[PDB]
């Protein structure tokens, strides 16, 4: 019934949340790595102007 | 309401106010509330994913141009 | 009011809001399909709830009579 | 994303509703069995009273 | 072997006898259809008999345990 | 006559067999309900033993 | 077998001999036997109906000719 | 099961028998009436020869 339905919904919503969190952690990590490269490469361009 | 988020938050309040008034057990309400909050957090995450995905692709192009 | 009337009113609100927002019609058509499914589900859930409750009362009764 | 979430919800509720249509028939049968049993047990208790 | 083998042998006898008799083929085709129905019925009757017997044993058991 | 008798027998056994295919499914369900009940009643009798 | 009647009567004997040997209750056997006998009487009646129906039609014609 | 099937068969075979008996009684009566007419009409033809 509706109780078992709520338990099932909880399970699915919670699994979805776990997956979204993992994906978000990886994306933040990807972004951090890419921004490091951006800062390194910008600094090299600035040095070439001097 | 300003946004879908505010509308959903309002619609949830109305629903909680209704269930409480018809008299739903504390446990069922407490279950529904944590569900609601996970759904709110999930939509926030879905949005941030969309935004971080676009930003990542722009950084890939930026980095190739700066190299 | 009842659960069903509140959920129809909220559906009516949400649907209007999204139309004002310019929401793509494929998403709106999907939401409309989901709304129908949820209304249908409520009728079926109530049938099941009532039959389930009677079944359990009869099992109890028959355990007392045997 | 939110699109894919909606497609999945549609499938799940569609499947659940078909399970409930089948379960209605099962429960109707459960009731016929139970009422038949009730009548038999009542008759036997009435016999012991004499 | 058994009930089923005896009934197949009797069907085989009857069918031969009627063929020697010149029996019209529409009647023979009907008898053949009936034979198939009766063989099918036996398999279904045995399923039902076995399930029925187990159901009644379980009802008894559950009345003792409750 | 004997022809008409045979046509009627065909119809009756055809109908009866379809009832038995349906009854098989009902009885399968009856068994699942019964075994579930058995398990519950056994567990409760085991609890009273302590 | 001489005839269908004799074949059916033989096939019935075989079946009764089988059920008795596998051990079927007296009541079930007594039920099956009265069924058998009604089926034998029924086929006899079906035949007589066919014969009386043809004879009746020949008498209708005979009577019209004699009038 | 097969017991209830035998009861049902008995009912049908017995009803069939009752119907066949009624039909046979009426046919015998029809034949008796027609033979009376045959004997009357034959006798009148014989009288016309004398
Ligand atoms: Zn449900
Ligand atoms: Zn890494
Ligand atoms: Zn947003
Ligand atoms: Zn909230
Ligand atoms: Zn609606
Ligand atoms: Zn309702
Ligand atoms: Zn999502
Ligand atoms: Zn059930
Ligand atoms: Zn065969
Ligand atoms: Zn078998
Ligand atoms: Zn007949
Ligand atoms: Zn049943
Ligand atoms: Zn004959
Ligand atoms: Zn005989
Ligand atoms: Zn049967
Ligand atoms: Zn008359």
Swiss-Prot record, chains B, G:
Residues 38-66 are annotated as: Leucine-zipper. Residues 1-67 are annotated as: Transactivation domain. It comes from the Eukaryota. Expressed abundantly in testis. Coiled coil: none annotated. It is found in: Nucleus. It is linked to A chromosomal aberration involving MLLT10 is associated with acute leukemias. Translocation t(10;11)(p12;q23) with KMT2A/MLL1. The result is a rogue activator protein. A chromosomal aberration involving MLLT10 is associated with diffuse histiocytic lymphomas. Translocation t(10;11)(p13;q14) with PICALM. Self-associates. Interacts with FSTL3 isoform 2; the interaction enhances MLLT10 in vitro transcriptional activity and self-association. Interacts with YEATS4. Interacts with SS18. Interacts with DOT1L; this interaction also occurs with the KMT2A/MLL1 fusion protein. Interacts with histone H3; interaction is necessary for MLLT10 binding to nucleosomes; interaction is inhibited by histone H3 'Lys-27' methylations (H3K27me1, H3K27me2 and H3K27me3) amd acetylation; interaction stabilizes association of MLLT10 at chromatin; interaction is essential for histone H3 'Lys-79' dimethylation (H3K79me2). Probably involved in transcriptional regulation. In vitro or as fusion protein with KMT2A/MLL1 has transactivation activity. Binds to cruciform DNA. In cells, binding to unmodified histone H3 regulates DOT1L functions including histone H3 'Lys-79' dimethylation (H3K79me2) and gene activation. This is Protein AF-10. It comes from Homo sapiens (Human). The chain holds residues 713 to 779 of 1068 of the full protein.
From Swiss-Prot, chains C, E:
Residues 1-66 are annotated as: Transactivation domain. It comes from the Eukaryota. Expressed abundantly in testis. It is found in: Nucleus. This is Protein AF-10. Residues 37-65 are annotated as: Leucine-zipper. Probably involved in transcriptional regulation. In vitro or as fusion protein with KMT2A/MLL1 has transactivation activity. Binds to cruciform DNA. In cells, binding to unmodified histone H3 regulates DOT1L functions including histone H3 'Lys-79' dimethylation (H3K79me2) and gene activation. It is linked to A chromosomal aberration involving MLLT10 is associated with acute leukemias. Translocation t(10;11)(p12;q23) with KMT2A/MLL1. The result is a rogue activator protein. A chromosomal aberration involving MLLT10 is associated with diffuse histiocytic lymphomas. Translocation t(10;11)(p13;q14) with PICALM. It comes from Homo sapiens. Self-associates. Interacts with FSTL3 isoform 2; the interaction enhances MLLT10 in vitro transcriptional activity and self-association. Interacts with YEATS4. Interacts with SS18. Interacts with DOT1L; this interaction also occurs with the KMT2A/MLL1 fusion protein. Interacts with histone H3; interaction is necessary for MLLT10 binding to nucleosomes; interaction is inhibited by histone H3 'Lys-27' methylations (H3K27me1, H3K27me2 and H3K27me3) amd acetylation; interaction stabilizes association of MLLT10 at chromatin; interaction is essential for histone H3 'Lys-79' dimethylation (H3K79me2).
């Amino acid at each position: 019934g509706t109780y078992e339905d709520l338990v099932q919904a909880q399970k699915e919503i919670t699994a979805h949340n776990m997956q979204l969190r993992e994906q978000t952690k990886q994306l933040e990590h990807d972004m951090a790595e890419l921004r490091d490269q951006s800062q390194l490469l910008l600094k090299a361009r600035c040095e070439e102007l001097k | 309401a300003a946004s879908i988020e505010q509308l959903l938050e309002r619609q949830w309040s109305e629903g909680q106010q209704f269930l409480l008034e018809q008299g739903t057990p504390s446990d069922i309400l407490g279950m529904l509330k944590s569900l609601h909050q996970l759904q709110v957090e999930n939509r926030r995450l879905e949005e941030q994913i969309k935004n971080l995905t676009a930003k990542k692709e722009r950084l890939q192009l930026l980095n190739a141009q700066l190299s």
